[PDB]
């Protein structure tokens, strides 16, 4: 079940992002837990023989941009 694996990826990501809400706009810093999220989404996509990117994975990507990065400054 890819949907279940995705929730696993998303919940691990949320666990990393929650304690550092003050630094969601620290681009170089948040790129690490974000990269793991992407690696996780791709890993299970491959495991379940689905393509990557796929719509569910892309909804997750849109979700973090909506809740974490949408109002961040691009610099400094």
Curated annotation (Swiss-Prot):
<feature type="disulfide bond">
    <location>
        <begin position="9"/>
        <end position="40"/>
    </location>
</feature>
<comment type="similarity">
    <text>Belongs to the RAMP family.</text>
</comment>
<feature type="topological domain" description="Extracellular">
    <location>
        <begin position="1"/>
        <end position="76"/>
    </location>
</feature>
<feature type="glycosylation site" description="N-linked (GlcNAc...) asparagine">
    <location>
        <position position="71"/>
    </location>
</feature>
<comment type="subunit">
    <text>Heterodimer of CALCRL and RAMP2; the interaction forms the receptor complex for adrenomedullin/ADM. Heterodimer of CALCR and RAMP2; interaction forms the AMYR2 receptor complex for calcitonin/CALC and amylin/IAPP.</text>
</comment>
<comment type="function">
    <text>Accessory protein that interacts with and modulates the function of G-protein coupled receptors including calcitonin gene-related peptide type 1 receptor (CALCRL) and calcitonin receptor (CALCR). Required for the transport of CALCRL to the plasma membrane. Together with CALCRL, form a receptor complex for adrenomedullin/ADM. Together with CALCR, act as a receptor complex for calcitonin/CT/CALC. Together with CALCR, also act as a receptor complex for amylin/IAPP.</text>
</comment>
<feature type="disulfide bond">
    <location>
        <begin position="25"/>
        <end position="72"/>
    </location>
</feature>
<protein>
    <recommendedName>
        <fullName>Receptor activity-modifying protein 2</fullName>
    </recommendedName>
</protein>
């Amino acid at each position: 079940n890819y949907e279940t694996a995705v929730q696993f990826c998303w919940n691990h990501y949320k666990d990393q992002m929650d304690p550092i809400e003050k630094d969601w706009c620290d681009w170089a810093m948040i790129s690490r837990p974000y990269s793991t999220l992407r690696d996780c989404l791709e890993h299970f996509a491959e495991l379940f023989d689905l393509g990557f990117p796929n719509p569910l994975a892309e909804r997750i990507i849109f979700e973090t941009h909506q809740i974490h990065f949408a109002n961040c400054s691009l610099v400094q």
